[PDB]
Design an enzyme around this catalytic site. Sequence first.
Site, PDB file in Angstrom:
ATOM      1  N   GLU A  21       0.799  -1.228   0.000  1.00 21.98           N
ATOM      2  CA  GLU A  21       0.000   0.000   0.000  1.00 21.98           C
ATOM      3  C   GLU A  21       0.838   1.287   0.000  1.00 21.98           C
ATOM      4  O   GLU A  21       0.378   2.310  -0.519  1.00 21.98           O
ATOM      5  CB  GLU A  21      -0.959   0.027   1.200  1.00 21.98           C
ATOM      6  CG  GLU A  21      -2.003  -1.080   1.217  1.00 21.98           C
ATOM      7  CD  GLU A  21      -3.149  -0.992   0.227  1.00 21.98           C
ATOM      8  OE1 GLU A  21      -3.233   0.000  -0.535  1.00 21.98           O
ATOM      9  OE2 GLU A  21      -3.963  -1.944   0.204  1.00 21.98           O
ATOM     10  N   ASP A  43      -6.236   6.251  -5.077  1.00 23.42           N
ATOM     11  CA  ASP A  43      -5.644   4.963  -5.444  1.00 23.42           C
ATOM     12  C   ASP A  43      -5.949   4.630  -6.922  1.00 23.42           C
ATOM     13  O   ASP A  43      -6.483   5.479  -7.647  1.00 23.42           O
ATOM     14  CB  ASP A  43      -6.143   3.850  -4.491  1.00 23.42           C
ATOM     15  CG  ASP A  43      -7.644   3.589  -4.450  1.00 23.42           C
ATOM     16  OD1 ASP A  43      -8.407   4.385  -5.038  1.00 23.42           O
ATOM     17  OD2 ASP A  43      -8.055   2.596  -3.809  1.00 23.42           O
TER      18      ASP A  43
END
Length: 442
Positions: free
Chosen positions: A212, A221
């Site tokens: 991440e 994202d």
Amino acid sequence: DEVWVVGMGIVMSLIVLAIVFGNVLVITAIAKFERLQTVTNYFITSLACADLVMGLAVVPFGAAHILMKMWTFGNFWCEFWTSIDVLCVTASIWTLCVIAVDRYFAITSPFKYQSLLTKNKARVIILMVWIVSGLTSFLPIQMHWYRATHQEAINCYAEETCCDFFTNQAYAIASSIVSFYVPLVIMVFVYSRVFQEAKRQLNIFEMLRIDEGLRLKIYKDTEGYYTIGIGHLLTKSPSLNAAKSELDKAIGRNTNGVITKDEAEKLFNQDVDAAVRGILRNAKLKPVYDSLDAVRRAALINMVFQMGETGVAGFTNSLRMLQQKRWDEAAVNLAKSRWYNQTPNRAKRVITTFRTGTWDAYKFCLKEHKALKTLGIIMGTFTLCWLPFFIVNIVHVIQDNLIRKEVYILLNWIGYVNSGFNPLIYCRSPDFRIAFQELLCL
Ligand SMILES: CC(C)CCC[C@@H](C)[C@H]1CC[C@H]2[C@@H]3CC=C4C[C@@H](O)CC[C@]4(C)[C@H]3CC[C@]12C
Ligand SMILES: CC(C)(C)NC[C@H](O)COc1nsnc1N1CCOCC1
């Protein structure tokens, strides 16, 4: 030949220029930038110093001894030059052994990447190295305990124009074992354990920090939803103030879209705990988490972290083969998914973890783990540069007529080029990268 002398002269000058400017830049970067004033960087300062003394006092006079084929500096400087030469090498290998040992004690400690030694303690260790190695490098040459008994050597000692390093069989073994091999054998064994501990002590928290990543400012994202910290989703809404509203409530203060390391870790420890709790609550995922080993348990947590308990449950076919322990079989169905297409880089790492049952996919993927790799490259290159010379040096002790004089100097110079390699290897560290370009104004 004329062309050979001019040809060698340029090569040796560019070597000398690369040694001095390289190490000066490194020493300057540690001396100026505070972010680089670490225990491990203080050992690198000692390493860079020895490498600088090499290209300033050793290597320059070494070149003159080759291009003129005679010593033109006297028998007092000849012995002092050789004494410094040995010290430069002896101090460097012991420095590398200290770095290796300090890295073992740090990785075995709960601090994991921070040194147990303080800045005052590190200075003492460096000063002790230079003093102890200074004695084992100057006393056996100044007291002439190194001097050989054969005529050819005594003729070279008496001659003021001869600085060919002749030695007795005793010193040649004794000095080389204490100075080179003993710290090398230890260094290799200790730092191989450092690499072995780093890979083994890998956990889900490091695995998610790798996948991440970390950002203390709101970002979008691959999916396009508002995210902050270590892949912590804020909202599916395409509104910055909506993302800011859900953030200020979670932390409990006026963040204004900015969080701290303390804050980012706090929400991360929650998300990880929520993922495992979600697995225990889900009936489809619950028996799969049981059968898996510690390594593969983290890989299931990783998918639940990215997609969610419900999303991960959809891979019914794949989950069934995880329970059946048919990893290679399950991997194909995991690859044959939209999740694999969405994040292929992250998917590969997680799928391989299920296949191997090891952290081999997450090898040196961490920033803290890359620092260890760089230090391992320094130690490994020193070995490749010095060990050939040292092997042939000890081969010469057993059998006199094994190698020629030109082979000894050539292999000694393989070790000399090493004093110009270390600054280029520090380009791996982004902290040094930024320091270098700032001093060079680029
Ligand atoms: C050629 C011989 C005689 C000279 C040897 C040079 C000596 C004086 C140098 C080389 C390496 C140096 C050290 C390099 C690393 C550091 C870290 C720095 O934060 C404080 C000083 C300290 C601890 C230095 C002290 C002086 C030192 C030991
Ligand atoms: C021979 C010459 C030109 C003085 N170079 C010396 C080498 O660079 C390294 O010297 C050493 N540093 S630590 N141990 C040694 N040696 C190698 C030579 O034999 C004595 C022990």
